Structures are given as C-alpha cells and as structure tokens.
Amino acid sequence: ALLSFERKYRVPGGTLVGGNLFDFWVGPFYVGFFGVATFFFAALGIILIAWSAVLQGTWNPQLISVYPPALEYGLGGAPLAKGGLWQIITICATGAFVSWALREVEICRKLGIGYHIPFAFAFAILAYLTLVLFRPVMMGAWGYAFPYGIWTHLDWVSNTGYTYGNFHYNPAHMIAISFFFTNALALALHGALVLSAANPEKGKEMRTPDHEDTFFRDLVGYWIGTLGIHRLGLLLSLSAVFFSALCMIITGTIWFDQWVDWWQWWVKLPWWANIPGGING
Amino acid sequence: AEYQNIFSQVQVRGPADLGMTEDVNLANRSGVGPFSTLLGWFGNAQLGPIYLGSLGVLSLFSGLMWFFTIGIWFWYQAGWNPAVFLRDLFFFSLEPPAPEYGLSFAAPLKEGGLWLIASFFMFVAVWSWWGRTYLRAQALGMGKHTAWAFLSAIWLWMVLGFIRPILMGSWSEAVPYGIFSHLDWTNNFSLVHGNLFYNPFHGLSIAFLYGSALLFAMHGATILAVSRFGGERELEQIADRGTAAERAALFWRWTMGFNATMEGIHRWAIWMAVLVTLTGGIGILLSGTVVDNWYVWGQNHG
Amino acid sequence: DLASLAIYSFWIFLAGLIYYLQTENMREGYPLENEDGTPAANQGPFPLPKPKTFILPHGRGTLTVPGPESEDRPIALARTAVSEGFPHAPTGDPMKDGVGPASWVARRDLPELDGHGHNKIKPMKAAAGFHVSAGKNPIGLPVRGCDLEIAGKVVDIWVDIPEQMARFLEVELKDGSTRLLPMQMVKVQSNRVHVNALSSDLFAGIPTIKSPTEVTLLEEDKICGYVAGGLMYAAPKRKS
Numbered sequence: 156a157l158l159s160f161e162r163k164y165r166v167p168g169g170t171l172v173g174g175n176l177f178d179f180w181v182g183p184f185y186v187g188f189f190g191v192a193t194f195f196f197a198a199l200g201i202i203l204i205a206w207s208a209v210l211q212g213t214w215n216p217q218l219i220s221v222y223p224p225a226l227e228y229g230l231g232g233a234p235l236a237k238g239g240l241w242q243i244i245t246i247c248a249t250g251a252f253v254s255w256a257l258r259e260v261e262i263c264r265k266l267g268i269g270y271h272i273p274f275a276f277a278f279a280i281l282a283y284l285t286l287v288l289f290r291p292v293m294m295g296a297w298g299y300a301f302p303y304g305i306w307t308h309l310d311w312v313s314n315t316g317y318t319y320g321n322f323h324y325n326p327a328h329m330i331a332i333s334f335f336f337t338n339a340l341a342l343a344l345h346g347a348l349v350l351s352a353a354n355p356e357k358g359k360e361m362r363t364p365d366h367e368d369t370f371f372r373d374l375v376g377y378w379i380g381t382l383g384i385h386r387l388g389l390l391l392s393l394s395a396v397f398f399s400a401l402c403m404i405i406t407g408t409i410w411f412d413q414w415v416d417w418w419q420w421w422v423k424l425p426w427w428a429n430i431p432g433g434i435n436g
Numbered sequence: 437a438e439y440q441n442i443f444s445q446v447q448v449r450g451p452a453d454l455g456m457t458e459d460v461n462l463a464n465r466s467g468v469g470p471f472s473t474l475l476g477w478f479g480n481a482q483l484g485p486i487y488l489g490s491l492g493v494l495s496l497f498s499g500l501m502w503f504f505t506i507g508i509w510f511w512y513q514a515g516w517n518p519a520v521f522l523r524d525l526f527f528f529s530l531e532p533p534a535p536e537y538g539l540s541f542a543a544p545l546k547e548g549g550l551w552l553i554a555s556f557f558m559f560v561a562v563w564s565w566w567g568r569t570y571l572r573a574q575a576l577g578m579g580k581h582t583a584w585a586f587l588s589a590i591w592l593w594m595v596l597g598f599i600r601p602i603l604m605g606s607w608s609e610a611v612p613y614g615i616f617s618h619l620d621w622t623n624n625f626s627l628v629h630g631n632l633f634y635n636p637f638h639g640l641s642i643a644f645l646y647g648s649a650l651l652f653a654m655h656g657a658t659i660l661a662v663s664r665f666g667g668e669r670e671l672e673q674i675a676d677r678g679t680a681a682e683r684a685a686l687f688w689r690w691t692m693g694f695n696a697t698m699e700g701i702h703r704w705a706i707w708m709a710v711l712v713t714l715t716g717g718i719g720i721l722l723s724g725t726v727v728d729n730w731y732v733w734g735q736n737h738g
Numbered sequence: 739d740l741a742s743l744a745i746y747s748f749w750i751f752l753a754g755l756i757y758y759l760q761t762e763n764m765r766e767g768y769p770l771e772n773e774d775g776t777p778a779a780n781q782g783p784f785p786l787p788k789p790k791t792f793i794l795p796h797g798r799g800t801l802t803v804p805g806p807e808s809e810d811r812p813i814a815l816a817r818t819a820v821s822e823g824f825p826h827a828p829t830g831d832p833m834k835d836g837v838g839p840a841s842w843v844a845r846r847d848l849p850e851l852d853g854h855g856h857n858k859i860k861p862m863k864a865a866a867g868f869h870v871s872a873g874k875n876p877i878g879l880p881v882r883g884c885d886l887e888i889a890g891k892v893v894d895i896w897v898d899i900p901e902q903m904a905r906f907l908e909v910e911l912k913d914g915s916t917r918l919l920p921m922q923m924v925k926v927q928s929n930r931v932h933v934n935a936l937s938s939d940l941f942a943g944i945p946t947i948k949s950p951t952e953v954t955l956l957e958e959d960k961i962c963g964y965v966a967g968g969l970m971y972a973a974p975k976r977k978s
C-alpha cells in the first residue's frame with residue numbers, strides 16, 4: 156500500500172475544500188473533495204455514452220460516436236438523442252477535467268511543492284475548450300465542435316481542415332507544429348543525455364553533470380543546463396498547445412477563406428508584385 | 437507569485453568552465469565565447485567552447501554544399517533578381533527528377549540533376565554528424581543513448597528521401613526542397629494513399645508526438661515544482677534519492693495511482709520521443725509499396 | 739497481408755517495452771509496505787527488477803538498486819485509524835521532527851562534488867572570482883518574514899559553481915550566526931528580501947551546517963524541507 160519512503164509524507168492538511176472529511180487515500184489514490192467530484196463527473200459521463208450506445212444500437216468502441224447538435228439548433232439546447240447527450244457529456248467532461256486540476260493542487264499543498272503541474276494541465280483544458288466551446292460559440296453553433304468517437308473525430312479533423320483548403324498554410328499552425336517537433340527533439344535529447352551519464356561505457360564510473368554540459372558544448376557549442384532544459388521542455392510543450400488553440404480560435408471566426416491566400420501580404424507588395432520571372436510572376 | 441522559477445531573478449558569473457577533458461582531443465576545441473545575459477535569464481550564459489574533429493569539419497562543409505546547391509537553384513528560378521528572390525523565397529522548390537528517369541542518376545541538372553547532388557551532400561552531412569554525436573559520447577566515456585535516439589530520426593528521413601523512393605522505383609517519390617512545396621507534397625501524399633488517418637502506424641506516431649508534449653510538460657513542471665529541493669540535479673538524485681525525488685514520485689503516485697523513479701522517467705522520455713519517428717518511418721515505408729489505400733485497407737482490417 | 743503483420747508485431751514489442759519500463763521504475767520505493775511497516779501482500783502484476791550497480795565517481799563507493807531500504811531516522815507520526823488509507827498525525831512539532839511537507843531524507847552527510855572533485859556548492863566569498871552579473875544584488879538587504887518583521891540581512895550568496903547559478907542566500911541572524919535560504923523560496927525586491935514560508939522567529943529553527951564554507955547533501959534537504967514545511971505549519975501567525 157505504501158512506498159518504502161511514503162509513510163512520513165501522508166499527513167493531514169492541505170485540502171482546499173471540505174477540511175478533513177475527504178482527506179484520505181484509497182490505495183495509492185488520494186481523494187480530497189475534488190477526487191469525489193472527479194469520480195462523480197466521470198461516473199455520470201461514462202453512463203451517458205452507454206445510453207448513447209444503446210440508442211445507436213452497437214457496443215463495439217470503434218463505431219461508438221456521440222454527435223453534437225445539428226447546425227440548425229444553433230447554440231440552444233437539443234434533445235438527448237439529437238445532440239443533447241453530447242452537451243451534457245461535454246459539461247461532465249469539463250467538470251471532470253477542472254476537478255482533476257484542483258485535486259492536483261491539493262496534492263501539491265500537502266507535499267509542499269510548486270503548482271506547476273496543474274498550471275501546465277490547464278493549457279490542455281484550454282485546448283479542449285477551444286474546440287468544444289470557444290470556437291463553436293463564436294461561430295454560433297455547437298455543431299462545429301468535434302464528435303466523441305475514435306474514428307469520427309478523426310474525420311472531423313479531416314473535414315474541418317480541408318474546408319479551408321490546405322490547413323498547412325495557417326501561420327499559427329506552423330508555429331504550433333514547430334514547437335511540437337522541437338519538443339520531441341528536446342525530450343529525446345534530455346532523456347538520452349541523463350541516461351548516457353548515469354549509464355556510461357562498460358568499465359567506466361558514473362559520469363557527472365559536468366560531462367553532460369561538456370557533451371553538448373562539444374557537440375553544438377552550448378548547453379542550457381539542468382534547470383534550463385526543464386524550463387525549456389515545459390515552454391515548448393505549452394507553446395505547442397497554446398498556438399494549437401490559437402490556430403483554431405482564429406479560423407472560421409476572423410478568417411473564413413483558404414489559408415493559401417493568407418501569404419499575399421508578402422507576395423503582392425507594391426514593390427515587386429509586378430516584376431516578371433520567378434514562380435508567381 | 438512567491439515562486440516563478442521560469443526565469444532566474446539573479447545572475448551570477450565566474451571564470452569560464454573549460455569542461456571535462458577525459459579522452460577528448462583538446463587541440464580541436466575552440467576558445468570560449470562571450471557570456472550572454474539574455475540567455476542567462478533562462479539557462480547558462482556561457483557560449484562555447486565547441487569541438488570540431490575530422491567528422492565535424494566534414495559535416496559542416498557537406499552541409500554548406502547542400503545549401504548552395506539549393507541556394508543557387510532558388511536564385512536561378514528567380515531569374516537572378518534579388519527582389520523576386522525574397523518575394524518568392526517560400527515558393528521556390530528544388531524538385532527530384534521526373535518519373536521518366538526512374539532510378540537513374542542520368543538526369544540533367546535543370547531537370548532533377550541538381551536535386552540528386554543536393555541530396556548527396558545532405559546525406560554525407562547528416563551521417564557524418566551522426567558519427568560525431570557518437571564519437572563525442574565515446575570520447576567522454578558516456579553512453580551512446582544520444583546516437584541511437586538520433587538514429588531513429590535518421591530512419592524517418594531515410595525512408596522519406598531514400599529507402600521508399602528506391603522501393604517504388606522512382607526518385608520522383610522523394611521529397612522536394614522548398615518551404616511550401618513539401619507541405620503540398622505532404623498533403624498530396626496523404627490524398628494519393630487514400631487518407632493517411634487510417635494508417636495505424638500514423639495514428640501511433642501521432643499518439644507518441646502528443647505523448648511527448650504530454651510527458652515533458654508533466655516532467656518539466658515536476659522538476660520546476662521540486663526545484664525548491666534541488667530536484668533538477670537529477671544525476672545525484674540517481675546516486676542518492678533525495679526528498680526531491682520522493683515528493684515528485686508521491687505526487688504522481690497519489691494522482692494516477694502509480695509513479696516512476698528519477699532514472700526510469702528518462703527511459704520513459706527517450707522511448708516516447710524515439711517512437712515518434714520510429715513508428716512513422718514504418719507507416720510511410722508500407723504506403724504505396726504494400727498498401728495503396730489505407731481507408732479501403734482499413735475497412736477490411738486485413 | 740504484410741501490412742497487418744507489421745502492426746500486430748509492433749503491439750507485442752510495445753507491450754514488452756511497457757513491461758520493461760514499469761519494472762525499471764520499481765527500483766525505488768519497492769517492495770510496497772503495509773502501514774505498520776510490514777511488506778504488503780499485493781505487489782502488483784509486475785515483478786521487482788534484478789539488481790543494478792552504479793559506480794559512484796570520486797571514489798565514493800558503489801550503489802546497488804534495488805536493495806533493502808531504511809529511513810535511518812525516527813518518524814514522529816501516529817496512526818489515525820485502524821484501517822487503510824487514513825493520514826498519520828504528527829506526535830510533536832512537524833517542522834522540527836521532519837514530517838509531512840517538512841520531511842527530509844537521510845542522504846550522505848557529504849557535499850556534492852563537480853567533475854573535477856571540488857565542492858559543487860560554495861559561498862561566493864570563497865569562489866574566485868564570482869560576482870553578480872545581472873538582477874538585484876541581495877547582499878546587505880534586510881530579510882523579512884511573513885509576519886512582516888526583519889529577521890536578518892543577507893551577508894553572502896552560495897552559488898552552484900559548475901552551473902554558475904545562485905542556490906542559497908546566507909542570512910545573518912540577530913545572534914550573529916547565519917542560516918541558508920533556498921533561492922527558490924525567497925523573492926528579492928528593490929529594498930528587501932521577502933520570505934513567504936517563514937515567520938521571523940522561525941528562521942532560527944533552520945538546521946545548521948557544520949562548516950562555514952561547505953554544505954552537505956543531508957544538510958541541504960534538512961534546510962529545504964524545513965523551509966517548504968513552513969507554508970503549512972507557519973499559517974497560525976497572521977497579520978491583517
């Protein structure tokens with residue numbers, strides 16, 4: 156039930172709500188008031204899919220798909236079988252996600268550590284809300300959000316993207332992608348670096364953090380440091396998700412056309428928008 | 437906020453660290469550069485020294501040759517006009533030989549011949565750099581974890597540019613050199629192969645790409661939150677588990693029911709990232725060679 | 739169909755990979771223990787990994803993991819319930835007894851070394867020739883607690899020499915002696931240093947180092963643990 160060093164940390168206190176009423180553990184899991192809330196939102200949400208699967212008539216997971224209301228319903232309430240369930244599930248999902256973050260905060264207080272983890276998780280919540288709340292509301296219909304299905308939500312991504320031609324040309328898109336790639340790049344490098352120092356060549360002693368700095372300075376001429384790389388990794392991942400939500404909040408709201416045409420404010424400048432030759436001319 | 441730790445509040449500076457010696461040839465190390473106050477807020481301020489070696493020099497050169505080959509061609513398409521060059525910088529493209537020439541190197545320079553020359557220089561630059569990443573680790577007596585992880589990325593790049601076009605029997609199946617053009621190449625590739633979304637290796641790669649942004653955000657935030665116990669000094673936490681490592685482990689143990697160790701998390705990290713390019717290379721390799729249409733192939737699941 | 743074969747084979751690898759990673763992450767804290775100290779019956783579906791040996795640098799010996807683990811320190815806590823899953827209440831002073839957020843682990847009572855064998859952490863006065871290159875110089879500034887009362891003044895900075903980074907402020911108390919404060923637990927302002935975690939009379943409770951020019955790993959956790967614990971255990975002292 157306990158890690159060999161765990162007992163001395165499991166003390167009372169740190170709760171944000173409910174005092175000591177929900178201040179206990181179930182196995183490894185900590186509860187807290189938001190633990191009960193999380194379980195409550197999750198329980199109801201899972202039940203809703205089951206009743207959606209019954210109406211759909213199937214029970215294999217790879218076809219189960221809970222759709223939002225039709226566009227004609229606008230931003231109003233819908234019947235359960237015609238987008239209503241989706242609305243309630245989304246409410247439960249949002250409730251479940253937010254509760255999870257607040258539960259992490261309670262754990263942070265009891266351990267006397269920073270609040271970086273739920274803060275970072277908040278970005279993930281922001282991205283989800285961008286697709287299911289912010290963008291649909293700004294466009295005036297819940298139907299612009301994605302369906303809750305394994306393959307159908309993939310189609311939503313496929314359908315939404317091509318609606319604006321080639322979605323590659325979204326400038327906020329490129330930035331988000333660049334951070335996603337760079338993040339995987341930094342993750343691989345950081346993991347490899349630490350492991351290579353802790354697990355050196357055979358017949359060699361364990362290396363020092365001085366070797367890690369020296370390796371990258373020999374390699375690229377600079378090392379950011381042990382503290383800086385974790386700062387960097389957090390920034391890269393957060394920035395990737397931030398611009399991700401950004402690239403979606405501006406499409407279909409302040410921009411309705413094909414992203415191919417965005418790049419005209421460079422090409423068709425009144426300096427060179429007439430000079431013959433080249434690809435465009 | 438009593439506790440930011442995204443940027444340092446006070447910078448300190450002393451004599452430059454020349455670094456560990458071990459078995460590196462010090463004769464090939466440069467001098468130290470200037471200190472960067474700007475960089476000092478986020479990480480280390482020290483610039484340099486850098487190591488060359490025979491492979492490093494060869495890598496930079498062959499790299500630079502890869503650019504100029506692309507660079508000259510870009511200037512050529514712009515009719516040697518500097519303005520039209522910077523206007524259509526993103527529209528320029530060095531394309532591979534037409535299907536007519538198959539897998540032959542007998543294509544004229546203005547019809548894919550230059551692309552072959554460029555690709556040759558890039559091939560040497562990358563692999564010589566890979567050997568460099570290997571030798572730098574070996575010279576310091578460190579593990580080869582970096583080179584093997586690098587090898588996963590090379591694998592993806594090799595499939596896209598070399599391995600798959602050869603299997604398809606045409607160099608035209610390779611990737612062109614140009615900002616916008618390969619984006620169109622990427623989109624067209626998915627269209628041709630019947631919507632890539634139904635490639636299982638493709639979905640896996642995405643899952644690991646997402647998972648990489650997931651894991652690091654968790655790990656990065658964890659270390660920063662535990663920085664108040666000197667938790668970022670991970671190597672010494674390995675050799676001697678501190679209250680830093682314990683509180684970090686318990687946070688996740690209490691959150692998700694299970695946890696990691698200070699070493700094992702980096703094993704999670706290196707595999708999560710590697711699996712991105714590892715799975716992706718497989719998915720591309722099977723596309724067009726084994727499967728023509730993934731959606732149709734998917735609906736039969738066989 | 740070859741395409742189907744490749745993906746079926748990968749899942750096998752992925753499952754084996756997951757198995758490898760999980761056991762590798764069970765090298766610390768395992769085996770699981772019951773709340774009475776005795777080993778737990780259910781150890782999970784994954785077995786303990788076979789031992790691993792680290793050869794520590796600078797002749798500081800070797801480390802075999804996993805191995806039998808001890809706290810090597812008394813834990814002043816009391817059980818709140820007969821049953822599993824309830825908190826353990828402190829029997830004395832949690833900050834002084836080192837439990838909860840104020841906990842510390844029995845690391846080796848020796849300083850961490852750099853790659854060259856020199857002490858990794860040393861006061862700036864004994865580090866030629868370090869100086870403050872940017873930001874607000876905290877030396878000479880008054881140190882203030884959460885009770886808004888001056889507890890002392892910063893007399894020096896303890897820097898991480900290989901990383902060239904400030905880690906500790908050395909704060910002189912009313913009795914002339916000094917204490918170390920984590921740089922992450924303080925906020926340096928234009929005319930003062932603010933410490934949210936401690937009241938002015940809790941600064942003296944910070945564990946003392948045995949040498950004025952070096953700090954050991956054991957001492958660091960005692961200091962860091964104590965200061966972090968003040969967030970929960972110094973809450974009674976308020977001012978409105």
Ligand code: BCL
Nearest residue numbers: 252279280282283312313315316322323331332399400403
């Ligand atoms: C043909 C299709 C189009 C296209 C259409 C779109 C559309 C449309 C969108 C994207 C979006 C994105 N695309 Mg695009 N995209 C294309 C091509 C690309 C290429 C490429 C190589 O060419 C790349 C690299 C990308 C990359 C990306 C990212 C920038 C972004 C997805 C990450 C994100 O937002 O996460 C955000 C993160 C989250 C939503 C995570 C939320 C997590 C929640 C909280 C988890 C809860 C817990 C869960 C239920 C737990 C279950 C536990 C149980 C135990 C199982 N696209 C093409 C051109 N793309 C999306 C975007 O930006 O979204 C904001 C988006 O909507």
Ligand code: BCL
Nearest residue numbers: 201283286301305308312638639640642643644646647650
């Ligand atoms: C970000 C922009 C798009 C989008 C674009 C894509 C694309 C493109 C792909 C996926 C893929 C996946 N997406 Mg999606 N996805 C979006 C929003 C979501 C949300 C959400 C609430 O925001 C969730 C939970 C998911 C969930 C999932 C997984 C089923 C799958 C692998 C992701 C992964 O491993 O990530 C990293 C996370 C982890 C490693 C942690 C563990 C996550 C587990 C595996 C998630 C299981 C979800 C489960 C079915 C949901 C709850 C069910 C209840 C428990 C009953 N997507 C939006 C709409 N997603 C891939 C797929 O379908 O592969 C077959 C894929 O190709």
Ligand code: BCL
Nearest residue numbers: 589590592593622623625626638641642645716717719720
């Ligand atoms: C309409 C377009 C298609 C599509 C078509 C493709 C194709 C085609 C491919 C991908 C690939 C990828 N796609 Mg997709 N993709 C779409 C939609 C998405 C969505 C989404 C939410 O919609 C997401 C999240 C993704 C995400 C991804 C990644 C999982 C994957 C690339 C991994 C990587 O790091 O590459 C970037 C890393 C590399 C290319 C490795 C480079 C290694 C070499 C050694 C680097 C050399 C650098 C050189 C020396 C110097 C360069 C300097 C710079 C130029 C500045 N795609 C849709 C369905 N996508 C790739 C893949 O693996 O697919 C299976 C791929 O080729």
Ligand SMILES: CC[C@H]1c2cc3[nH]c4c(c3C)C(=O)[C@H](C(=O)OC)c4c3nc(cc4[nH]c(cc(n2)[C@@H]1C)c(C(C)=O)c4C)[C@@H](C)[C@@H]3CCC(=O)OC/C=C(\C)CCC[C@H](C)CCC[C@H](C)CCCC(C)C
Nearest residue numbers: 197200248251252255275276279303304646649650653654
């Ligand atoms: C910085 C943003 C990045 C990020 C980071 C991040 N995620 C986090 C955290 C952090 C820092 C956490 O601390 C927390 C955590 O514990 O992670 C392991 C979390 C988390 N990241 C998660 C997953 C996740 N993160 C994703 C993305 C990202 N995570 C970003 C890339 C994705 C993607 C790309 O899709 C997924 C699937 C979880 C493992 C966890 C949050 C767990 C949680 O919310 O628990 C409470 C909820 C439940 C137990 C279940 C609720 C079920 C609903 C009521 C019904 C179903 C709704 C669902 C929408 C149906 C449709 C599914 C289909 C689309 C398949």
Ligand SMILES: CC[C@H]1c2cc3[nH]c4c(c3C)C(=O)[C@H](C(=O)OC)c4c3nc(cc4[nH]c(cc(n2)[C@@H]1C)c(C(C)=O)c4C)[C@@H](C)[C@@H]3CCC(=O)OC/C=C(\C)CCC[C@H](C)CCC[C@H](C)CCCC(C)C
Nearest residue numbers: 336339340343495496499561562565585586589709710713
């Ligand atoms: C785990 C998978 C990830 C991965 C792994 C990985 N890559 C790696 C490593 C690892 C583990 C290394 O060790 C190695 C390295 O040295 O990192 C510092 C590397 C590396 N990954 C690189 C890039 C890279 N990796 C990428 C992706 C990824 N690499 C994956 C996400 C991407 C993309 C497309 O997302 C890129 C661009 C290099 C920084 C480096 C390999 C160095 C190399 O090959 O050097 C020889 C090349 C040169 C001397 C030329 C340098 C080019 C400049 C950066 C300029 C480019 C300018 C552009 C083309 C301009 C066009 C217009 C002009 C003509 C006008």
Ligand SMILES: COC1=C(OC)C(=O)C(C/C=C(\C)CC/C=C(\C)CC/C=C(\C)CC/C=C(\C)CC/C=C(\C)CC/C=C(\C)CC/C=C(/C)CC/C=C(\C)CC/C=C(\C)CCC=C(C)C)=C(C)C1=O
Nearest residue numbers: 190194654655658684685688692695696697698701704821
């Ligand atoms: C050392 O550091 C480390 C790092 O850093 C350095 C790290 O970065 C990381 C992080 C790295 C990782 C996480 C490893 C890599 C893994 C990933 C890539 C992440 C992917 C994660 C997953 C896929 C797992 C998903 C997580 C899940 C499934 C969470 C599970 C959630 C639930 C099942 C629900 C949660 C349960 C709760 C909240 C409580 C249950 C609810 C209840 C109400 C219980 C019911 C209670 C009652 C019955 C009433 C109470 C009973 C009483 C009172 C008893 C009465 C008394 C009696 C005596 C009878 C780690 C771990 C780390 O270690």
Ligand SMILES: [Fe+3]
Nearest residue numbers: 345349659670
């Ligand atoms: Fe780390």
